[PDB]
Amino acid sequence: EVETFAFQAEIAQLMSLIINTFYSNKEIFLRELISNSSDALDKIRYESLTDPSKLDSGKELHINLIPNKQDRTLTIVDTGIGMTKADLINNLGTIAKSGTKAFMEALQAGADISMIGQFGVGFYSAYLVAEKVTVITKHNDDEQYAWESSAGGSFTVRTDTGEPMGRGTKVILHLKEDQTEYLEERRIKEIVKKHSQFIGYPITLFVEK
Numbered sequence: 001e002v003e004t005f006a007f008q009a010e011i012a013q014l015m016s017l018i019i020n021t022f023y024s025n026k027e028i029f030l031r032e033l034i035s036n037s038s039d040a041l042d043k044i045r046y047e048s049l050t051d052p053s054k055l056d057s058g059k060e061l062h063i064n065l066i067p068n069k070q071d072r073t074l075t076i077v078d079t080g081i082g083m084t085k086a087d088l089i090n091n092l093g094t095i096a097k098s099g100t101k102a103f104m105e106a107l108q109a110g111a112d113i114s115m116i117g118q119f120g121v122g123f124y125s126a127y128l129v130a131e132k133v134t135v136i137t138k139h140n141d142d143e144q145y146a147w148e149s150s151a152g153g154s155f156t157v158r159t160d161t162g163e164p165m166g167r168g169t170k171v172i173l174h175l176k177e178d179q180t181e182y183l184e185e186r187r188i189k190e191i192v193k194k195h196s197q198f199i200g201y202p203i204t205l206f207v208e209k
């Protein structure tokens, strides 16, 4: 059972901007996703200080980067606080409203796309390299859900039937045909060292066999 929702007008405008403009410095998407994962891990770790039972769904706090040349996907996995159904559908997009408007004002005040993180909307930089993004997420207070969008103004949310995650979020990037360099080991390493050398959680690169 799948529900289809329309993106808020300003978010749909940002994604169409991100997809259609010519911007060569596409590697910043990984920094933004890793920084988002760091925030999610900070939140569960902070909450667990007053409630250790919040870690019953997993004590490990880490980030895994998993390229797959066969499927042409790059997957970013964190064991952070995860996302509820209301987060996926309403609350997060409501908070991103002001940032998207301001980010688009800044895009005419000099700023470029690489500053997307300073407006709290860095996640949508995934569409610099991805034609489709799938988000599997599990929050302690909700079921496992699957969010998906190929942009174009709509996204879907459904209960996920696949492998249970425990807790956290999995961002699956279905890369565009010309963006397969982000499946390469030495390319991901160079990006992580340059942009995320100061993340307070272990970032593990899964190399393919």
Ligand SMILES: OCCNC(=S)NC1CCCCCC1
Pocket (backbone or CB within 6 Å): 036, 087, 088, 089, 092, 093, 096, 120, 121, 122, 123, 124, 135, 147
């Ligand atoms: O970082 C930018 C703000 N977006 C966040 S925090 N999360 C996104 C995940 C996909 C579905 C929920 C809402 C959008």
